[PDB]
Structures are given as C-alpha cells and as structure tokens.
C-alpha cells in the first residue's frame, strides 16, 4: 500500500552543474529512502540510504535530502563518470519498490564523428551470406544519419544500427551500421559504401571501397 | 489532513490455575505477518496498551523495557526518530519487548514477545494522545 | 566479499528452473537476501527476500506462488525456484545483500553480483560464427570482431584476454530479420601498432557452450 513516483524521467545538463532528482512518496513514509546508481549493462551500485547515509567509497559531491514526502537526490557537480541510470527505492529488509527512474545524460561540446569502412570477410562469404558495416566512433550529438550507396545507388530495408551508450569518460557516442546482403547481390555491384550526415561535417563525408581491392 | 497515526497492542489471557494460561490473544494493530512488520508512515504516533484480558483474576500483565532502550509510553514522551516499524515476530537486530504477566505478582510467565526496529533520525516524533474506545 | 549469479540461460515457456546465488565473505544467515529482476530496457521491480536464520519468506504482490525463494546455509548460498514462466518474466536476475548500521530498521543494498540473463522462448540454443572486421583503409584507423546468427543473448566479448580496455566499443546487440541476435565489437588503434601488434578477440556464448579466440589481421 506504499510506492514512489520518480521525477524527472530523463535529463541532460552541463558538466559540473547541479542536478536534482526527486521521488514523491505515494503515501508518505519514514527514513527507508535510498538512492542507487546503475551503469549501462552493469550491476546496480549503492549510493545513499535514509538520504543522509553514504556508504564508504561514495564521493562527497552526492547529497540526499528529505522534504516531507518529496525526497531529493542532488549531485552538486556533474561528472562524466556519473553518466548512468539512477533509481530511488523506499523500503526496508521487507517489501520495497522502485520508481520509473531517471537516466542522466551529459551535455557537452559538438563532437566530430570518426568514420571507418569495413568490407566483409572472405571467410564470411563462405556461408553464402555477406555483411558490411560502417563505423562511427566518438561523436556528439548522438542524433545522426547513416546512408548506404551502392554503385551510386542508395539502398534500404537492409540497414540495422546499434547505438553506444554515452562513454564513461569520453561522453561521446559510437554507432554500428550493419548493411546485410546475400553473396549474389554482393557480387552484383562493386563500387559502393557509406555516407554520413551530421552537424560535425560542414560538408557530408563518405568512405568507399571497390570490391576486393 | 493526516499526520496522526496510532499503533496499538491488544492482549487477552484466560486462566493448576496458577500456570501458563491457555487463552493467548496477543494482537497487533494492522499487522499481517505475511505482509511483514508494520512500519509507521506518519510524522506523529502514540502508543497504548489494551487489557483485552478480562479483569476477573488477581493475575496482572505488563510490558517491561528489555532489549529495547526506549520503554513503551516513554516513547510517546517526545522521543525523536528517523524510522521505526513493529512486528510481533522477532525482527533481526530488533529491540525485544517482552510481553509478560504475573498471577497476582508472586508468580510470572514469559507469555509474549514484541520486537521493534530502530532507525536513527529526526522526522518521526514521540507523541501523546488521550484514551477513547475506538 | 562478493556475490555471483549462476544458472542463467534460456528455458521454454511453461518450464521451471532454479537460480544460484553464490556468496563470499559473510554467512548468509546473518543478512537479508533479495532477488531483483530488470526488464529489458525497463525499470527494476522487487521480487522477494529471505532471511535464512528465521526462515522469513517475503514475496512481492507480483508473484506469490509463481516463484519461491530459499537458501542453504551449508551451501552458504541462496536459491530461487521459478515455475510457469510468462513473457513478462523474461529479465535479468540479480541477487543481493542488505545491511543496517542501526540494525533493526532502515538499511540498504550494498553488494551486488554480476547478474545473469533468463529468456523464455521456444527457439532453442544456437551457435554463432565469428568473422573479422579487418584493417580498413584510411590518422589512426581501427578494427574489430563481428558476431552473427546467435540465439539467445548474452555473449561475452574480450580482446587479448581483456588486456585491451580504452577504445573497446562492444555495441549493444541487435535483433536480425531472421530472429537472431547480431552485434559487433571493435577497438580504435593507432597507425603504427598495426605492424607488430597481435590482436585476438575472445568470445563466449553461454547457450552454445562455445568459446572462440580469433586473431585479426589485414
Ligand atoms: C482476539 O481478540 C481480538 C480482539 O477482540 C479479535 O479481533 C476481533 O475480531 C472480531 C471478529 O473479526 C471483531 O468483531 C467484529 O469486527 C468487525 C470489524 O472487523 C466489526 O465490524 C464487527 O462489528 C465486530 O466488532 C472484533 O471487532 C475484533 N477486535 C476488536 C476491536 O474487538 C480476534 O478475532 C481474537 N482472535 C484471535 C485472532 O486470537
Ligand atoms: C495478509 O496475509 C494474508 C495471508 O493469507 C494474505 O492473504 C492472501 O495473500 C495472497 C498474496 O498473494 C493473495 O493472493 C490472496 O488473495 C490473499 N488471500 C486473502 C484471503 O486475503 C493477504 O493478502 C494479506 N494482506 C491483507 C490486507 O489481508
């Protein structure tokens, strides 16, 4: 008969700036409040208990406070390593529940992307299926667009892309654009590869490879 | 609206007459073992005792300060806290409130055990309120 | 003083399975022990906790009968049995500990295990094939290892037995049109290192029981 609502849902901010996260106690409670940090694809980490209790190995800048039902978690100065998801928990050794949580993002400089071109493996063609990739490394902002051009002809329905989470220190992003196609359709064309459009590039840039050169 | 909440203890017992009485009805308000120990969720709370036991015997009953430092009722004496919960079952690292009675006072039996959890802090407060049947 | 989740994998719907929580550093009887699931790309929710000494079983409103918790003291290790698994259940499963300085009341969860993944689907385990992303033409340049046609997640990627760190970018998994997972892992390198350096990607897939360490060369 007790829960909590975590606000905001998500945010970005400049580095070293103050960040506030709150949880309103659905039906207000006592000192069972606790905040935790979870890095992407990583084990959740303990931050604060009862607002005022910091486990050993916690940096000083983190603070936790109580204002009645509203429970506030304040990081005085935003640090890049802090980038992760953060969740608030109300409960004891019994019960407990979680709020929607707030992932925090780092707002930083306009970061140029690096591009690298990758044809398939000669050993990969053995299956009768082939695949290509265009590499994007260490860029910001995250929002960008990949293009695949084949014999000066664009393609579609074959592009699948994976997105890195913000880099622990770099605060940058990397992108995997995988273009899939069969052995036959590979050998059909030969002069082709990837184009990318981003704020970083005053003029969009393209890498290319002639088949098996 | 809200702020005042109460936790109450009901104990009834029934009577070798001067032996372990058979009728034990220790009762904890709003308490479900399965749900788990009740935890106060309000800034102010008051503590009261209930003689469900019929006044038909020289027997008498009381809860004595024991493992827990803060005795019942003294708790109400404006004692601050950060968090607190109560459960009939022993709570690990918990204060023990022995619930006991004596036939007359000459003989005694360890009839009941109440256990409590301490969380240091300032928001929660020891508080006094009066008596009514509700 | 560490924890380890074990027994994570895949089971088909309606199957039942049991999970292992290994402990190092403390007697499990002395502390509460909880299990928490993480829905894929969603919020965590509490499942249940158990106190070994007083055999206290506390579960969530979510799954009274569906799962059950236990632990063996001689094992010094906690178990989690589950039955009639449903699609919502598919999640990452972490076991973890609880501590209070006050003791009786207000506390927290201090130590976590690495956490394991559990999947419920009809498709059985399938093995991936590893193919190299080869030295490109570009300054710096970079190279990588590529994994395709595996089911189900997760996969373990390593470079030179984890000697490599900064510049690793193990991309999240992607779901193929077929119904398989395909991801790529890579690393940025300088131009000069290429001549001498020997770069090998160690990879392990738990449902296939297959571990490969393949070299990458131009
Ligand atoms: C032990 O003693 C307690 C205290 O009497 C018993 O609790 C009582 O349970 C009875 C039956 O449920 C209650 O009577 C009825 O309760 C309902 C509200 O739940 C009310 O609408 C009816 O008018 C009627 O009063 C009784 O009120 C309740 N306690 C009180 C306040 O007297 C308990 O059942 C006994 N047995 C055990 C568990 O040992
Ligand atoms: C109090 O404890 C009882 C123990 O029987 C709970 O009763 C069952 O709890 C399960 C929990 O999943 C429910 O699925 C059942 O519907 C409950 N049955 C009944 C008759 O209530 C009960 O939920 C607990 N809480 C309350 C407020 O009674």
Author numbering:
A (entry chain L): 1 to 213
B (entry chain E): 296 to 310, 317 to 435
C (entry chain H): 2 to 139, 144 to 223
Can you quote the paper on this entry?
To depict the currently elusive antigenic signatures of α-HCoVs S proteins, we isolated a panel of antibodies against the HCoV-229E S protein and characterized their epitopes and neutralizing potential. The S protein is composed of two subunits, S1 and S2.
To understand if its low neutralizing activity correlates with its mode of action, we then determined the crystal structure of Fab C04 alone and C04 in complex with 229E RBD. Among these CDR loops, CDRH3 is of particular interest as it contains as many as five Gly residues within the CDRH3 loop, which likely endows it with great structural plasticity to neatly fit itself into a pocket on RBD surface, through largely backbone driven interactions. Akin to these SARS-CoV-2 NAbs, the epitope of C04 also appears buried in the all-RBD-down conformation of 229E S trimer, yet would become fully accessible when its anti-clockwise neighboring RBD is in the ‘up’ position. In the presence of C04, a good portion of the 229E S trimers disassembled into C04-bound 229E S protomer (right) by the end of the 1 h incubation while most of the 229E S trimers remained intact in the absence of C04 (left).
